[PDB]
Amino acid sequence: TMNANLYKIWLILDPRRVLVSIVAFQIVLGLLIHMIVLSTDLNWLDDNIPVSYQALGKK
Amino acid sequence: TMNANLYKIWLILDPRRVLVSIVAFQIVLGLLIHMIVLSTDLNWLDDNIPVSYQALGKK
Amino acid sequence: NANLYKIWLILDPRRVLVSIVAFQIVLGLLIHMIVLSTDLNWLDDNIPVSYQALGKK
Amino acid sequence: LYKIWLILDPRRVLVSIVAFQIVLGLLIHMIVLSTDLNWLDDNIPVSY
Amino acid sequence: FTMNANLYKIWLILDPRRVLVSIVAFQIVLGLLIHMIVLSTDLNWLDDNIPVSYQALGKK
Amino acid sequence: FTMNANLYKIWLILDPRRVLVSIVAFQIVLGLLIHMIVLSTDLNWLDDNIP
Amino acid sequence: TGLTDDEAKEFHAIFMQSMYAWFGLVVIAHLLAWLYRPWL
Amino acid sequence: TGLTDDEAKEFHAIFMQSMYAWFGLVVIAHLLAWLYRPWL
Amino acid sequence: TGLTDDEAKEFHAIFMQSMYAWFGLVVIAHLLAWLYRPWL
Amino acid sequence: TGLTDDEAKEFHAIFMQSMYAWFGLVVIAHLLAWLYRPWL
Amino acid sequence: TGLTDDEAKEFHAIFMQSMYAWFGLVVIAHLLAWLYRPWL
Amino acid sequence: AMLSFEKKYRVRGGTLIGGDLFDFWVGPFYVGFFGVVGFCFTLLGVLLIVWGATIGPTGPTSDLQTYNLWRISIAPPDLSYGLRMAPLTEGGLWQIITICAAGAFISWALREVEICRKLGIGFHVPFAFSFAIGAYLVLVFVRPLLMGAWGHGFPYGILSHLDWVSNVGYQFLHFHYNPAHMLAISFFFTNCLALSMHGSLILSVTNPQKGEPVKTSEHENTFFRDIVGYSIGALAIHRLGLFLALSAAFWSAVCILISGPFWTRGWPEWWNWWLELPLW
Amino acid sequence: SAGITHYIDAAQITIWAFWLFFFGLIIYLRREDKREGYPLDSDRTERSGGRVKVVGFPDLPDPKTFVLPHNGGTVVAPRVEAPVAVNATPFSPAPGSPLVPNGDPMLSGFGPAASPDRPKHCDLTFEGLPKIVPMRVAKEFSIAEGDPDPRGMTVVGLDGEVAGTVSDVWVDRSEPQIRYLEVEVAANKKKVLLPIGFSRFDKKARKVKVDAIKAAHFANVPTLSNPDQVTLYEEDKVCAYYAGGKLYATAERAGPLL
Amino acid sequence: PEYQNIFTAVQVRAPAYPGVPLPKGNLPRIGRPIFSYWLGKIGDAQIGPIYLGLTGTLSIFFGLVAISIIGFNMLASVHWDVFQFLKHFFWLGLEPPPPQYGLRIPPLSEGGWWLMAGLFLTLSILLWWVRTYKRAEALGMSQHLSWAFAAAIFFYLVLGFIRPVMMGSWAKAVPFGIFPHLDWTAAFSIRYGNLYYNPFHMLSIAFLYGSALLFAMHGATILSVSRFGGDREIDQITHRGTAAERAALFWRWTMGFNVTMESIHRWAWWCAVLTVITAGIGILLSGTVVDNWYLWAVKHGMAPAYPEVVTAVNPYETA
Numbered sequence A, B: 001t002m003n004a005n006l007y008k009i010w011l012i013l014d015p016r017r018v019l020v021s022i023v024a025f026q027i028v029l030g031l032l033i034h035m036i037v038l039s040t041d042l043n044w045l046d047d048n049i050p051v052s053y054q055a056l057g058k059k
Numbered sequence C: 001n002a003n004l005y006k007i008w009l010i011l012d013p014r015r016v017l018v019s020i021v022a023f024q025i026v027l028g029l030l031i032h033m034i035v036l037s038t039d040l041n042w043l044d045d046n047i048p049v050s051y052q053a054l055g056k057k
Numbered sequence D: 001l002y003k004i005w006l007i008l009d010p011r012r013v014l015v016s017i018v019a020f021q022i023v024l025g026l027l028i029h030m031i032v033l034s035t036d037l038n039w040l041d042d043n044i045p046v047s048y
Numbered sequence E: 001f002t003m004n005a006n007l008y009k010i011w012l013i014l015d016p017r018r019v020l021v022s023i024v025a026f027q028i029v030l031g032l033l034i035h036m037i038v039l040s041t042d043l044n045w046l047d048d049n050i051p052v053s054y055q056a057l058g059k060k
Numbered sequence F: 001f002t003m004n005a006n007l008y009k010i011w012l013i014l015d016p017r018r019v020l021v022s023i024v025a026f027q028i029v030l031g032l033l034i035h036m037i038v039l040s041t042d043l044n045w046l047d048d049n050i051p
Numbered sequence G, H, I, J, K: 001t002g003l004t005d006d007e008a009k010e011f012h013a014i015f016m017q018s019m020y021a022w023f024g025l026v027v028i029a030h031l032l033a034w035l036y037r038p039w040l
Numbered sequence L: 001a002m003l004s005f006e007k008k009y010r011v012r013g014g015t016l017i018g019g020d021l022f023d024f025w026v027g028p029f030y031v032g033f034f035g036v037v038g039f040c041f042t043l044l045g046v047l048l049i050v051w052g053a054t055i056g057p058t059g060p061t062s063d064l065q066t067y068n069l070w071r072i073s074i075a076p077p078d079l080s081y082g083l084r085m086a087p088l089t090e091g092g093l094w095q096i097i098t099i100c101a102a103g104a105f106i107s108w109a110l111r112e113v114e115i116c117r118k119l120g121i122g123f124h125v126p127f128a129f130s131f132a133i134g135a136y137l138v139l140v141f142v143r144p145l146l147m148g149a150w151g152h153g154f155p156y157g158i159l160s161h162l163d164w165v166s167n168v169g170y171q172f173l174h175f176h177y178n179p180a181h182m183l184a185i186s187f188f189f190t191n192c193l194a195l196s197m198h199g200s201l202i203l204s205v206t207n208p209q210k211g212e213p214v215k216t217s218e219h220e221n222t223f224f225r226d227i228v229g230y231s232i233g234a235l236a237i238h239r240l241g242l243f244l245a246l247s248a249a250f251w252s253a254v255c256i257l258i259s260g261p262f263w264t265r266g267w268p269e270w271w272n273w274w275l276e277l278p279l280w
Numbered sequence M: 001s002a003g004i005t006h007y008i009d010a011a012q013i014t015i016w017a018f019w020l021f022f023f024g025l026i027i028y029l030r031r032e033d034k035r036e037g038y039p040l041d042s043d044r045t046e047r048s049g050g051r052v053k054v055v056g057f058p059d060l061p062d063p064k065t066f067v068l069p070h071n072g073g074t075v076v077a078p079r080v081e082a083p084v085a086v087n088a089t090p091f092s093p094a095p096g097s098p099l100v101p102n103g104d105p106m107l108s109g110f111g112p113a114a115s116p117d118r119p120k121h122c123d124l125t126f127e128g129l130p131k132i133v134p135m136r137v138a139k140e141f142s143i144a145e146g147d148p149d150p151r152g153m154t155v156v157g158l159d160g161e162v163a164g165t166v167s168d169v170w171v172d173r174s175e176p177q178i179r180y181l182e183v184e185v186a187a188n189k190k191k192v193l194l195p196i197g198f199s200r201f202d203k204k205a206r207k208v209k210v211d212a213i214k215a216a217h218f219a220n221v222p223t224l225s226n227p228d229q230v231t232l233y234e235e236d237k238v239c240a241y242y243a244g245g246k247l248y249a250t251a252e253r254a255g256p257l258l
Numbered sequence N: 001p002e003y004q005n006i007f008t009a010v011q012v013r014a015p016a017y018p019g020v021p022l023p024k025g026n027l028p029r030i031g032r033p034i035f036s037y038w039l040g041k042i043g044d045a046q047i048g049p050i051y052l053g054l055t056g057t058l059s060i061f062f063g064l065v066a067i068s069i070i071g072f073n074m075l076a077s078v079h080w081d082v083f084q085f086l087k088h089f090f091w092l093g094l095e096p097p098p099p100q101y102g103l104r105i106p107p108l109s110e111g112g113w114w115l116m117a118g119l120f121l122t123l124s125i126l127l128w129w130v131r132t133y134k135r136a137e138a139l140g141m142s143q144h145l146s147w148a149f150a151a152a153i154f155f156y157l158v159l160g161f162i163r164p165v166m167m168g169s170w171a172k173a174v175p176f177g178i179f180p181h182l183d184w185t186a187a188f189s190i191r192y193g194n195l196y197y198n199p200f201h202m203l204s205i206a207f208l209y210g211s212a213l214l215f216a217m218h219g220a221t222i223l224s225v226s227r228f229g230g231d232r233e234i235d236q237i238t239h240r241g242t243a244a245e246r247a248a249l250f251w252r253w254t255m256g257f258n259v260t261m262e263s264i265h266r267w268a269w270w271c272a273v274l275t276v277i278t279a280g281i282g283i284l285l286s287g288t289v290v291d292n293w294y295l296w297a298v299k300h301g302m303a304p305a306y307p308e309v310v311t312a313v314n315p316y317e318t319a
């Protein structure tokens, strides 16, 4: 609602200003998430399948 | 009823400082809250389901 | 692409272009590491880690 | 895309890859010679 | 050879004073580095088996 | 020798005083750095064989 | 300050509106969160 | 600021929708992510 | 900025296109991995 | 400072042909290593 | 920079003969090493 | 490149022990006769050390050998080889690095001087830096000598070098009572107070209250002339500072040069000469 | 921490926190660091670092508005500046090569003795009168009871030989500290402000040696417009001169020793 | 051989400047300012006068009270026999309440005076931060001291109200004597792992260093270019000059990047504040959070690993 009126914001906030400042979040938040998640839930990297190629493959 | 009266609050608060200010506080609390929620509230990520599957499949 | 050429008016081509040139290597060098690290190492974890530790003696 | 050197002076990114290579060459031989294999004593000759 | 054709032009960019010595620096740093790294693990030729392994003869 | 013939022109880019005294200090240490590294294990002539 | 009435009044609404969009967005969350992993 | 309601309206729109492109892009991720390995 | 929509799109062409040159060469990368050493 | 297709192109030619030059030195490098000692 | 096309040519040559100089010197000693005692 | 106004100071020469050769810049750094050398050691260290990171404890293979700053550390040789070059693998390498690092701070230190000259300024900077330099010698040299052991110094571990203190520190039980360590500590504190005042005050006068003039000393020289009553003065602060710090360092320097080669009992004891005074 | 992901707890979260806001505030400074002197001038070299951004990674901050004291214009930052002159010739065209001080360097106004053009308005005290003044108007002052009065001390060139003497020692209403000494030179019979900072006291022989410029150079010393007070512009002006002496007064100085 | 601004060689003096007058509320300044040639051979030789408002007195009073407690109880110790009080000075002190009354008001004896005295070095300390922000802006001055003061005053509370009282222990709160206090830090390191492993300390260190570093540089730098009015930063902040010209340039051709006669003073105020900040951090975590930071560390893959030339046995297991 008021999505029509919400356009005026640019008249108070620089586009470039809130522009790159978001482009950041994705990086800052992006690596941060994957990082936060790996240890906490489903450590997809070394946890489950496939079984170690190091020991299973060599040995 | 006070709704009609409330508009004038802008007359003392600069748009820049409080408009994005809140943008700053809202962002901080979400990071905090999602962060306090795990400790006692529920480590939804690795608490119950699904978890521990990786170890059962790792080897 | 059709209309997205407009963005090049808010972001400098050299600044955004080079800025990203640097971003991948850091995000790059950081990847094979985070992957190579604990994840399924490939360099010498298994084979041909044969000569690595055996060939020696 | 050859028209790309219009936004970058040669020197600026010409050397930004001259060193970047060296800051990787040593790194590469070092991470490899590190864990992968140690061509030095990892095979021949056998420890004295 | 192959890249020899137009490598004379590079000299406007790369100044002689600016990059002539810079190399002399890397080389010297590399030199020690290489002899150093080689000596640490591979064949510590210095005091390993030849020619007369004297240090062991006197110490013992 | 090989490079000797026209290498003479390089002195227009390498002032003597600076390249001369410079090499002096870098070489001297370069030697100690060697004996040092050499004298460490190779053969500590001091205490190694005789007398 | 640094504004007048017709702007304060007008903007006042625009912002205000959006503020609630959140009270909803966040509510669907607190409600859905409770819906899934309730609490208290 | 430093721009009339015109250019603003112009940027606002083109941008607004695009920001939806992600809400959509990332939503196909969370979505497909739930598929491979759900959680909660 | 510092250019009109004429050379802003021309560059955008080279930029955008080549930008895919990676999204593709990077997909062949991962895909080449998904076939050699898989993951999950 | 300044750059023009005339002078710009000239350099790209010499540069690009030097780029593969190294790349060719990298294919011969690892490939040859693939023969002496394998990896992975 | 600090030269023109001519001087650029003049130096590129004289030195180029010097760079290899080291190099050749390099291989003879890098080789002598390989021959006398093999690494690998 | 150059600063908005740098373009006008880059005179010619001014070098120390020669350097009118490489007397030029690169990026925003002046080279000279020291920017050159320091570099050498830098890589023949920053990377020479890499070799170490590679090698590790047992060998480059030992599960002990890792690549996590948190753990990676080059260990000095055993007290065995007293004042002698140890086997890189067993100690030397460590020495080697340390060998370099010495000059890398002796060069950059001097290089500072050449600069201080060019920019026709005062030299308080280097002279200061030296102390800091020294405290690094009398804590891996002046001491280990009067201990006959190079390997008797400390490591090069991101955090590993921490314990090295933990021990040598407890080697006297309550290291805390060391007369020096007390003062030397006190300084590293006082400094971190005055500093937290000057750098504060200023940033509170040049950028004062809303709709207010860039205040003048006529305030500063009273700001504390009110709270605390007296004001060391403005020129002064930039004195007390260097003082504190350039002392704190030199102090601590003493602090660990005497701990050992000049005192073997637990410090707590040293504090006895006090008690035993033929008075109380 | 270097490998990737291992342990998992609470406190370890926070360590990320601060050690994040740091990398944020770090930039804040970066910007605040750039105010003046920015942007850079030439292309003698590019920005050394990881990500060679156009001009500094932190987008230059905005203009800051410095509300000067009473009866004072207003200053801001950043604030574009008008290019200056370069009274010197590059010893070499090579980027990063030095610039020789054309003609007489002692005044060529370059590097060792260069300076900016600060406002030509004597910096005043709290209420109005100008801070730095000679002991003339500074009549309400008095030498530190004890310290040997410098009024009458004969200055002496770094060459040793005399070079005029002194007069009024420009005190200050802000802080009872001597900042300048009037030096009625010998050849010029004029007045050249002596920057105490450069004046070494020798209370033993009434002298005041200044190992900065030869006795003669006291003649080329930028002359004071008015003797009853000095403006910021010149406050930097007199100083910068002697400064040069540090690398000019003798062929020796400037050139390397070994 | 140039007068290196060490001690103001020749000095001079003018009447007692009782600072810029204050508005309607700031009571009269007080004191008949004095001069000391010596003190002055380093800085502003004038002494005073000083302000004294409400918190001014109110705070000072709440000050020389704890002292008159932590001071008294202490003397009592060596049975009011000063001679030894003088001897066992650096040893003496006043300990907190026994683990029993964890938070309860300790008896007039067992650690009581300490909780009493403590709270009076809890307010007066907090009240003096008021004797700042107050006398601070009433000078038309912004607030950056008042700020930091907190950061510091924060850490102080992380060594009391906020943590000691946070673990229910009128003991977990530092003693009250040079040595004993010198011991508390010692004791702490132990009771919980070994601080060298709690990042927020190994962190708060780098800062206590930086400050020990920077305010140590800029102190010199200024001096180096103090001839060129560097010391006058004030204006240099506004109207630049050869000072900030020569200075920053230095660091430019040294460590590369550099800043402004302004900026620096920033990092200054920062490193500093960002010190006690990280201080009270660890000290807050260490206690109600991780109990052994050494374990924490390694458990996170932090703590290093060396060979083993020595190891022991374990009675609790074989016996």
Ligand code: BCL
Binding pocket: C020, C021, C022, C024, C025, C026, C027, C028, C029, C032, C035, C036, C042, C043, D004, D013, D014, D017, D028, D032, I022, I025, I026, I027, I029, I030, I031, I033
């Ligand atoms: C971990 C699982 C796999 C694996 C999976 C992958 C995958 C998946 C990918 C790679 C990719 C790469 N891998 Mg791999 N890789 C493995 C093991 C290795 C090992 C090893 C020793 O074992 C090594 C040394 C490498 C090395 C490399 C790099 C060659 C390459 C790029 C990385 C990057 O981030 O660039 C970041 C980029 C940049 C810094 C520069 C920007 C690129 C742009 C588009 C070009 C420049 C344009 C410019 C403006 C024009 C002017 C020209 C000049 C720049 C002046 N891999 C294992 C076996 N690897 C990537 C790749 O090869 O892409 C082709 C990739 O996508």
Ligand code: BCL
Binding pocket: D018, D021, D022, D023, D024, D025, D026, D029, D032, D033, D039, E010, E014, E023, E034, E038, J022, J025, J026, J027, J029, J030, J031, J033
């Ligand atoms: C790891 C398994 C193998 C191995 C596999 C490989 C592989 C695979 C490669 C190398 C390559 C190299 N290896 Mg190896 N290598 C091994 C063991 C060694 C040992 C050893 C003691 O055991 C040594 C000393 C080396 C040393 C070297 C270098 C000679 C060489 C380049 C490295 C580099 O990236 O530089 C970084 C960067 C540079 C040198 C700069 C780029 C050069 C450009 C093209 C010229 C600049 C042009 C300029 C504009 C003009 C100015 C002219 C002058 C500067 C004035 N290897 C083991 C046995 N090695 C690389 C190689 O040989 O490439 C040809 C390579 O691809």
Ligand code: BCL
Binding pocket: A009, A018, A019, A022, B023, B024, B026, B027, B028, B029, B030, B031, B033, B034, B037, B044, B045, G018, G022, G025, G026, G027, G029, G030, G031, G033, H040
């Ligand atoms: C804690 C227990 C539950 C849970 C309960 C909740 C609850 C309850 C809520 C969330 C909410 C959110 N959760 Mg959660 N959440 C959980 C697990 C997760 C996980 C996870 C990996 O496990 C993730 C990644 C998230 C992530 C998220 C965010 C998408 C979302 C908003 C956070 C916020 O406060 O922003 C901070 C806010 C702001 C900065 C301001 C608002 C921004 C808006 C969109 C823009 C305004 C217009 C602007 C002026 C235009 C210019 C654009 C740019 C600003 C320049 N949650 C667990 C399972 N979560 C909230 C939500 O969904 O809101 C929709 C919410 O209320």
Ligand code: BCL
Binding pocket: L101, L105, L131, L132, L133, L135, L136, L138, L139, L164, L165, L166, L167, L168, L169, L170, L174, L175, L176, L181, L184, L185, L188, L248, L249, L251, L252, L253, L254, L255, L256, L257, N185
């Ligand atoms: C065992 C635990 C003991 C203890 C044991 C020790 C021991 C053991 C030692 C100290 C030392 C010191 N301790 Mg103690 N200490 C304890 C508790 C404390 C406490 C406390 C609050 O609890 C404090 C405040 C201190 C304070 C101090 C300092 C006074 C002192 C010197 C530090 C220093 O800065 O050297 C200054 C050092 C330098 C300037 C050198 C490094 C700089 C070099 C020149 C440049 C590096 C460049 C780099 C390589 C290049 C790359 C670029 C990068 C960007 C950097 N200790 C506990 C009780 N302490 C040390 C000392 O007294 O040294 C003299 C010492 O040896």
Ligand SMILES: CC[C@H]1c2cc3[nH]c4c(c3C)C(=O)[C@H](C(=O)OC)c4c3nc(cc4[nH]c(cc(n2)[C@@H]1C)c(C(C)=O)c4C)[C@@H](C)[C@@H]3CCC(=O)OC/C=C(\C)CCC[C@H](C)CCC[C@H](C)CCCC(C)C
Binding pocket: L038, L041, L042, L043, L044, L045, L046, L097, L098, L100, L101, L104, L105, L108, L109, L112, L125, L126, L128, L129, L130, L131, L132, L155, L156, L157, L158, L159, L161, L245, L246, L247, L248, L249, N209, N210, N212, N213, N216, N217, N251, N254, N255
């Ligand atoms: C009281 C004095 C304080 C101080 C002052 C000080 N430091 C200074 C200066 C001054 C005045 C400079 O002028 C100089 C500077 O920044 O100049 C621009 C500097 C400096 N202070 C520095 C560091 C530093 N200072 C410290 C402390 C202090 N410096 C004191 C608090 C500390 C610590 C631990 O407390 C550190 C780490 C540098 C950033 C810089 C000097 C840079 C320099 O000369 O570097 C030369 C070498 C290289 C860049 C490459 C390194 C290659 C080597 C071969 C490896 C060395 C390995 C090392 C010994 C092991 C480290 C591992 C540890 C984790 C165990």
Ligand SMILES: CC[C@H]1c2cc3[nH]c4c(c3C)C(=O)[C@H](C(=O)OC)c4c3nc(cc4[nH]c(cc(n2)[C@@H]1C)c(C(C)=O)c4C)[C@@H](C)[C@@H]3CCC(=O)OC/C=C(\C)CCC[C@H](C)CCC[C@H](C)CCCC(C)C
Binding pocket: L189, L190, L192, L193, L196, L197, L227, L228, N059, N060, N061, N062, N063, N064, N067, N124, N125, N126, N128, N129, N132, N145, N146, N147, N148, N149, N150, N151, N152, N272, N273, N275, N276
């Ligand atoms: C990183 C932050 C650093 C820091 C910052 C900091 N300190 C600060 C501030 C700031 C920003 C202030 O604003 C404040 C200050 O000085 O304000 C003017 C202060 C301060 N830092 C102080 C001390 C201090 N700071 C320390 C440390 C630090 N402070 C950190 C390093 C330390 C340590 C442990 O190293 C100490 C000891 C004080 C000087 C001052 C706070 C003073 C205060 O709150 O006083 C309250 C009032 C009293 C104590 C009453 C005094 C009673 C009488 C006036 C004296 C009579 C004599 C006395 C009782 C002796 C006994 C004699 C008997 C016989 C009677």
Ligand SMILES: CC(C)=CCC/C(C)=C/CC/C(C)=C/CC/C(C)=C/CC/C(C)=C/CC/C(C)=C/CC/C(C)=C/CC/C(C)=C/CC1=C(C)C(=O)c2ccccc2C1=O
Binding pocket: D023, D027, L042, L043, L046, N210, N214, N217, N218, N219, N221, N222, N243, N244, N247, N248, N249, N251, N255, N256, N257, N258, N259, N260, N261, N264, N267
């Ligand atoms: C896998 C992998 C990535 C491997 C790595 C392989 C690599 C990279 C190998 C290369 C290794 C090499 C060669 C590294 C060296 C590279 C170089 C040259 C790095 C720079 C070295 C260096 C000393 C950097 C600075 C170090 C830092 C940041 C120290 C911090 C201390 C600190 C807070 C300093 C403050 C700095 C500032 C702001 C100075 C400015 C400043 C100050 C201090 C004033 O006092 C002053 C007074 C009056 C007016 C102005 C000023 C003023 O501007």
Ligand SMILES: COC(C)(C)C/C=C/C(C)=C/C=C/C(C)=C/C=C/C(C)=C/C=C/C=C(C)/C=C/C=C(C)/C=C/C=C(C)/C=C/CC(C)(C)OC
Binding pocket: A005, A006, A007, A008, A009, A010, A011, A012, B022, B026, B029, B032, B033, B036, G007, G010, G011, G014, G015, G016, G018, G019, G022
């Ligand atoms: C013509 O143009 C005009 C002039 C009209 C201007 C145009 C303007 C426009 C277009 C404006 C647009 C505005 C917009 C889009 C505004 C959006 C606003 C938003 C998203 C506002 C959000 C507000 C959020 C608020 C107010 C949150 C309040 C939160 C509170 C009070 C939180 C309290 C939290 C506590 C106590 C937390 C404690 C932490 C725990 C629980 C952990 O303690 C235990």
Ligand SMILES: COC(C)(C)C/C=C/C(C)=C/C=C/C(C)=C/C=C/C(C)=C/C=C/C=C(C)/C=C/C=C(C)/C=C/C=C(C)/C=C/CC(C)(C)OC
Binding pocket: C025, C028, C029, C030, C031, C032, C033, D017, D024, D028, D031, E006, E007, E008, E009, E010, E011, E012, E013, J010, J011, J014, J015, J016, J018, J019, J021, J022
């Ligand atoms: C008259 O005209 C005049 C003469 C003035 C101008 C003339 C100019 C001339 C003649 C110019 C000549 C230029 C030349 C000869 C240029 C040569 C250029 C070369 C050889 C360029 C080489 C470029 C190489 C590039 C761009 C390499 C890019 C490499 C990348 C992106 C590597 C990424 C590597 C990664 C991410 C490695 C990761 C390692 C792991 C996986 C271990 O990290 C975890």
Ligand SMILES: COC(C)(C)C/C=C/C(C)=C/C=C/C(C)=C/C=C/C(C)=C/C=C/C=C(C)/C=C/C=C(C)/C=C/C=C(C)/C=C/CC(C)(C)OC
Binding pocket: F028, F031, F032, F033, F034, F035, F036, F037, F039
């Ligand atoms: C007015 O004046 C008039 C015109 C009358 C002229 C009068 C002039 C006069 C009176 C001049 C007098 C001149 C004098 C007395 C000159 C004396 C000159 C001396 C004593 C020169 C000595 C130069 C000594 C040299 C060149 C030493 C070289 C040493 C070397 C290369 C040492 C190498 C050491 C190594 C490699 C050590 C390695 C140690 C280990 C093995 C441990 O490293 C691992």
Ligand SMILES: COC(C)(C)C/C=C/C(C)=C/C=C/C(C)=C/C=C/C(C)=C/C=C\C=C(C)\C=C\C=C(C)\C=C\C=C(C)\C=C\CC(C)(C)OC
Binding pocket: N067, N068, N070, N071, N072, N073, N075, N076, N115, N118, N119, N120, N121, N122, N156, N157, N159, N160, N161, N173, N174, N175, N176, N177, N178, N181
């Ligand atoms: C007999 O004495 C005469 C007359 C001769 C005068 C001489 C006095 C002298 C010489 C006094 C000397 C005193 C000295 C040397 C004191 C030294 C003190 C030191 C070194 C202290 C070091 C650290 C102190 C700390 C960390 C104190 C922390 C205190 C805290 C956190 C207090 C907190 C209080 C709170 C939170 C109170 C809350 C109120 C209640 C308890 C009701 O909340 C439940």
Ligand SMILES: [Ca+2]
Binding pocket: A042, A043, A044, A045, A046, A047, A048, A049, B054, I040
């Ligand atoms: Ca998985």
Ligand SMILES: [Ca+2]
Binding pocket: B043, B044, B045, B046, B047, B048, B049, B050, H039, H040
């Ligand atoms: Ca769950």
Ligand SMILES: [Ca+2]
Binding pocket: C041, C042, C043, C044, C045, C046, C047, C048, C049, J039, J040
């Ligand atoms: Ca493998």
Ligand SMILES: [Ca+2]
Binding pocket: D038, D039, D040, D041, D042, D043, D044, K039, K040
């Ligand atoms: Ca091998």
Ligand SMILES: [Ca+2]
Binding pocket: G039, G040
């Ligand atoms: Ca509940």
